[PDB]
Design a protein around this nucleic acid. Structure first.
Lengths: 488, 488
RNA sequence: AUUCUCUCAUAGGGAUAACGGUGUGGCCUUCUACCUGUUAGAAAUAAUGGGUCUUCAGUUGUAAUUCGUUGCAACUGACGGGGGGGUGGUGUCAAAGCCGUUUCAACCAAGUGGUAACUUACUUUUACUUGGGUUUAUACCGUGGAAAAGCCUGAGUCUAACUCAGGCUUUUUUGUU
RNA sequence: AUUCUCUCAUAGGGAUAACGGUGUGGCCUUCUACCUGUUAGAAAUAAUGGGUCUUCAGUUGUAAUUCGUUGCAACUGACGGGGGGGUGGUGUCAAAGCCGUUUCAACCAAGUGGUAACUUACUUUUACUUGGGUUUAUACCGUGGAAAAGCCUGAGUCUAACUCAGGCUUUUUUGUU
């Protein structure tokens, strides 16, 4: 297995995956444009298939070109690696505003360079896995971050008073002396072959200072740089998790968190670059007071973790409500707020097709398309497996039944109100349909009536409920674990 | 995928693997009996193919029978699990003397019971991995124990003064209250489904107190039982590793290790059972003195780990010397110490076939059959891969060049002496062969002369050297990691 | 050309129109309680078309119990928010409260100084689609072929005007279907 | 029978001799520096049969250098234990030492009170074999078939002795080869 063959394999697979993604993109756009023509009638806009802009910045960004000449590309890359002259091209970078007001520098390396990064740094991470800390993650969408969440959640329950502290490592990775990184190469038992060291130094040479964030090589260089910080924090007895440019350190003692603050400062001085807290607080059982500045809720990604429950962050709930509300608006209000209703099917005969489309869209967003019969078959024992998709697949550790119950109420209320305004607009256009099924149900009757309706023998009107799929999530986490439900 | 199909799959694979092992056993016995006939002439004994004795204690121990009726076996097992009446049969247990004077209770569950144990407890371990400690192992032959060794080794180098302590958990697992285990079932974020809880309780019910050791279910129940001991020790800042019924806890502080002793005692009291040290010492750079009782070497499995190097334990070096010495004795001395030399080829014509057989046996035991040309091809860059087998595959973390150099000298000296006694015995029989190649070389000439000799164009007389394959092992650890060399 | 093939190959050459995918339905097969017409049939069932619950907690009875708990009834306790404006009881010495009655509100909004819009969208990542595989129809990205229309340039007769040649843009059918 | 197939199946029924593997060599193909006969051949190489090194550290010169370091020479520094008995120099006021010279020792043994044995072996596990896959020969575990020998039991003539039937043990060839 020569290096050229490995490069050819990896580059071909990366380009093939990107080509499959583009194909599915334009196919999806066409299907959506068919449905949008049906929805918005003549007013419906026309399809506009885009191509990722960076594809034109360089030809090796474009997956199709790379697939065209991946053998030559890999041939030259292999020669460059063997002659120790390889240097990755410039990543197409785009700095993006962050909610704190900073900039998250997105970096897209060209397909050959990203293929090399995966091929080498995945091997390095696999071979040095036991040398790294437990909860170190590179992306904030990393599925395995949920394990860290679990840990903190468990502690926040068992420890009824936990001192926490949060930190931002953005400037560390933006400007970390490459000398420090190169010093760490032969410490802590790391196994980095000479060629792997050359590739590391080459990706660092294409850069000048800092580690490229949100990339294949991010996790390795981050763990390699932060190995001593992890070791000191582990000796202090503090528990910690780094995700992307954030770090959370929790303990049952105040002295420990203060000593961790000192450790982080000393490691920053050793690095020649500073780490700044977002900073320090105490989480306690709700109702119980606190001595230091305290907060009874911690925002960990899309989770609010408290000593009592794990819930969905308020921003995540607002986003879920935004998506459901826009589904109902797009399907039941927007088409009827257009200048003309030419080619827009009007609800009649006790059938509103737009309402079926909206309910199914909400079910896909929430359940993934599961029926309440399927979820109950899984919850009873009839079914030995349920596919977990939709929004709740991203919040598998939620255990706040009240939040889900409130969202159920909100879904029903918004369905009623949107249907009511749809009736109002329809009557404005000239169609009186208040007596028809979609518009006659009271809010306290929508769920029952919809549960009873059946089209094609399948109950496709049942209003999706968060609590049912939450029960299913709990059973599936007691049966498979986080990893299985997050990815099947 | 129904439970019966899963059970059939696992039982069939277990039985099939055991049948493959037996087939290879008797085939090896035949090949060895051919070679032994050629070696010991008429005095060579006759073949005696055995069958594992426990196969006759019950018919479900025998792989052939289990393969005969694995469908009915799995059918009944699945019904028993679904009706919550399944109880594993009695393991064929055999207490064995331990070097400390204790008894290691070997337990072999019947093939269906062991297949169920794997099927369920491997799933449990996979789904609760991140809830367990890093260096927790069930068997002392577990390959991954080497990672824990790496950790301690690294610390013992970086920390030039390390307080260590060792403990024996044998009585803990021999008698642990099953109530304590059952209490831990719903703590620490563990995910144990009701059926997995039933299987755990069933294997515990077949037992009365204690966890069956050296079994598929050992690691899960041990980690589930010791999870609070691990959490307490991790909060104390002590690092630790449990392997089978042993635990090593190390720190850079004396207070920490004493507090760990207190933690272990408290956990013992909570368990209703005592954990006793083998106990406490300081490892320091050689030459430097110590306050407390100190030792500059720690025996971790077949390793002696010191602040300066990782070496092979003295018992392991004795075992290696025993194997090499017996190879030379069996091939070059034993045949000639028989009553008659009927059918035993006598060295002549400057060719001793027995010496070729012995050198090749030593090469297999040491290198795995590698030629020095192959190892140097790998060490130069010519070859991109070398298979790592033989004795040194079990000691991949050795970095003591002096020990290997001394073993090289010992190999050459023993070869010279065994060949000399072979010449003496041959002359006693009537064959004068001191002038011939095998018996004319001085000890300072054996390696060179043998290196030059070639049969079939391949240098099969070269005296195997530990230092060459040690260099190869270091390169393969910097190129692949522990896991890759340990198992290809 | 995103196909196929050559160059000591992160770039350049050629040769052919194909390659790569998407929704629906079909078979295969993974797992799926009960009651039912009506088709076959001798009560063994299968495809079909209609319907019901299916979860969690406690109490009690019962059986096992290695003293963690476990199977079965069978009774109730939850199992679809919040807010604004009016309005009845409560429920107190007033009043918080909290029971219910009607209207308003597509969401953010239980809020902004104000409240609309938006899904190929905003974004620290807010990210994914209906167990696995394969073929009748409707398709899709690019490329190729054909036609039509418009514009520009050049040439011949030449006042006009007509004809031809080249280039550019747009729109339609197909070989993958 | 360890093969194939049936029983509401951790157990029982049947039907056939096969099933499951091992060493060697062959092709396929994964990676492999240099110099060479002698076979083909027009110097392009291929199968073959002989040979050499291939690692690490420092110094110095040189080129790059984001100031971690990196490519290339080219010089030396290691790159095959220990012990017992004699014996020479050193190397000191003696002496430890430590240079080398010869003998003894299969290992443990640089030790036990003593020193032999052992590999289907001892054992806390001291545990594995030659990159992946497949077919000419030599085989293997079990099972089946055939023959021979020995022993026991029963029956017929019966003093003996002979014949037949049944059971048990052992050893040899084969269908997988």
């Amino acid at each position: 297995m020569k290096l050229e063959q490995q490069i050819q394999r990896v580059i071909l697979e990366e380009a093939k995956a990107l080509i499959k993604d583009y194909h599915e993109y334009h196919n999806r756009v066409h299907l959506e444009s068919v449905r949008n023509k049906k929805r918005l009638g003549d007013s419906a806009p026309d399809k506009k298939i885009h191509r990722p802009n960076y594809w034109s910045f360089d030809k090796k960004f474009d997956p199709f070109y790379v697939k065209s000449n991946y053998k030559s590309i890999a041939r030259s890359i292999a020669n460059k690696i063997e002659n120790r002259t390889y240097l990755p091209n410039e990543p197409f970078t785009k700095d993006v505003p962050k909610p704190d007001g900073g900039i998250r520098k997105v970096s897209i390396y060209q397909i050959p360079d990203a293929a090399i990064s995966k091929l080498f740094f995945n091997r390095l991470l696999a071979k040095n896995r036991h040398r790294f800390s437990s909860f170190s993650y590179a992306y904030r969408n990393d599925r395995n971050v949920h394990f860290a969440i679990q840990d903190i959640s468990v502690d926040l329950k068992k420890n009824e008073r936990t001192f926490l502290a949060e930190f931002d490592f953005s400037d560390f990775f933006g400007s970390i002396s490459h000398s420090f990184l190169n010093e760490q190469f032969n410490e802590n038992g790391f196994y980095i072959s000479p060629e792997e060291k050359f590739i590391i130094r080459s990706f660092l040479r294409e850069r000048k200072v800092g580690i490229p964030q949100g990339t294949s090589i991010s996790l390795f260089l981050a763990n390699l740089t932060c190995w001593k910080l992890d070791q000191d924090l582990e000796r202090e007895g503090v528990k910690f998790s780094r995700y992307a440019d954030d770090t959370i350190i929790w303990s049952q003692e105040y002295s420990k968190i203060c000593n961790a603050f000192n450790i982080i400062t000393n490691f920053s001085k050793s690095a020649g670059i500073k780490i700044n807290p977002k900073g320090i607080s105490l989480l306690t059982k709700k109702g119980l007071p606190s001595e230091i500045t305290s907060k009874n809720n911690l925002d960990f990604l899309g989770y609010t973790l408290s000593v009592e429950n794990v819930s969905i962050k308020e921003k995540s709930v607002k986003k879920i409500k935004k998506q459901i509300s826009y589904i109902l608006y797009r399907n039941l209000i927007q088409p009827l707020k257009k200048t003309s209703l030419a080619g827009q099917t009007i609800p009649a005969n006790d059938r509103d097709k737009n309402f079926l489309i909206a309910i199914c869209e909400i079910r896909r967003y929430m359940y993934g398309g599961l029926s309440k019969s399927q979820i109950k078959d899984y919850l009873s024992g009839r079914s030995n497996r349920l596919y977990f998709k939709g929004i709740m697949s991203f919040y598998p550790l939620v255990n706040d039944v009240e939040q889900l119950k409130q969202l159920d109420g909100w879904i029903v209320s918004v369905i009623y109100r949107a249907l009511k305004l749809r009736c109002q607009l329809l009557s404005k256009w000239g169609y009186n349909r208040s007596h028809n099924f979609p518009f006659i149900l009271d809010r306290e009757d929508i769920v029952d009536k919809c549960s009873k309706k059946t089209i094609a023998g399948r109950k496709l009107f049942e209003i999706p409920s968060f609590l049912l799929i939450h029960k299913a999530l709990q059973k599936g986490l007691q049966e498979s674990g986080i990893e299985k439900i997050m990815n099947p």
